[PDB]
């Protein structure tokens, strides 16, 4: 869809999950948006 | 295919299908579709 669905410096609406605690099951879906356990345990909605 | 209401792979869209014809010679094979493939069995076999 790049021919019709792209912007010069846009297309921020296209999102994908970059990190997760564990892999999803076959044909499984996850819509949660909790902070990833980046090295440390997942922080509860804060920086750290 | 044409709904395009899945702009983000995160929170992807799902559908269930039953009670129809499934003529794959047209589906996934018209000009708009750039790529198409089947795993484990050829489309020619799936056609029937």
């Amino acid at each position, epitope marked *: 869809s790049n021919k*019709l669905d792209s912007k010069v410096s*846009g297309n*921020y609406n296209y999102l994908y999950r970059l990190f997760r605690k564990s892999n999803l099951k076959p044909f499984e879906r996850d819509i949660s948006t*909790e902070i990833y356990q980046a090295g440390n345990k997942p922080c509860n*909605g804060v920086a750290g | 295919f044409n709904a395009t*209401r899945f702009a983000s792979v995160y*929170a992807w869209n799902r559908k269930r299908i039953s009670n129809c014809v499934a003529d794959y010679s047209v589906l996934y094979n018209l000009a708009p579709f750039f790529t198409f493939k089947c795993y484990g069995v050829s489309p020619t076999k799936l056609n029937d």
Partner: antibody, heavy 123, light 108 residues
Framework: QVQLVQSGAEVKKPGSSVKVSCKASGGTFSSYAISWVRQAPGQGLEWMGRIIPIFGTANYAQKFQGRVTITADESTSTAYMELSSLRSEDTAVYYC????????????????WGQGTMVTVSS | DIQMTQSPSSLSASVGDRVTITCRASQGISSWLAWYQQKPGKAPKLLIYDASNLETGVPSRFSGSGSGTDFTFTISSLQPEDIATYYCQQYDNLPLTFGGGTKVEIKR
């Protein structure tokens, strides 16, 4: 339920800088997003910026880039906007909005506002 | 940047009459265009976000369609409580552009 609470009336001299707030409540704060909008007495709408407090990413309109900044903190459960170079034309009703449209197939449109803060710039 | 217009700028009809409006944009698209119902100084209510699509909670009283640079928006019926201004919005690209407005009111 999800709700937004805004501050009271605020006024400042031209050319100054002002701080405004939008208190979010209900459900889980980390799952919400906040946006800011301005509404005059009949002029068209203006959109200032957008933030995702859980992740801290923000973006802006070209008209307000540089002169305006947004910060939001979960611990205080409110979102903040920073304004500078205020002028008389800013006299309007200032609204904060929640963009829940990012995780269920609903995309990039608000469905919840606060009470709205009227603002005025005059000598 | 993306610019759009609405025509006609005002509608007047009696209670229970059919209403329709159209919105034009600068670039031809087939999705990512929204519609709003707005009143002076009051919050807009979302009815359409993408071409001919709506959420849960949107009443069946509103509808829209179109292709290319012109999309239509239709209202099944009108009542006095509906005195407001319909608006079209577009978000194919980040510089969101908002419509010129169409007033709707009651004939008498």
């Amino acid at each position: 339920q999800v709700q937004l609470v805004q501050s009271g009336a605020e006024v400042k001299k031209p050319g100054s800088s002002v701080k405004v707030s939008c208190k979010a409540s209900g459900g889980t704060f980390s799952s919400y997003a906040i946006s800011w909008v301005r509404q005059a007495p009949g002029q068209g709408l203006e959109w200032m910026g957008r933030i995702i407090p859980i992740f801290g990413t923000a973006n802006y309109a070209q008209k307000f880039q540089g002169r305006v900044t947004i910060t939001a903190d979960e611990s205080t459960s409110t979102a903040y906007m920073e304004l500078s170079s205020l002028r008389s034309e800013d006299t309007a009703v200032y609204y904060c909005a929640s963009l829940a449209s990012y995780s269920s197939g609903w995309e990039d449109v608000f469905d919840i506002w606060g009470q709205g803060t009227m603002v005025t710039v005059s000598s | 940047d993306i610019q759009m217009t609405q025509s006609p700028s005002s509608l007047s009809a009696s209670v229970g009459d059919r209403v329709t409006i159209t919105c034009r944009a600068s670039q031809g698209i087939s999705s990512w265009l929204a519609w709003y119902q707005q009143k002076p100084g009051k919050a807009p209510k979302l009815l359409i976000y993408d071409a001919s699509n709506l959420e849960t909670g949107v009443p069946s009283r509103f509808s829209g369609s179109g292709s290319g640079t012109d999309f239509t928006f239709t209202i099944s019926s009108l009542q006095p409580e509906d005195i407001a201004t319909y608006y079209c919005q577009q978000y194919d690209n980040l510089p969101l552009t908002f419509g010129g407005g169409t007033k709707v009111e009651i004939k008498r």
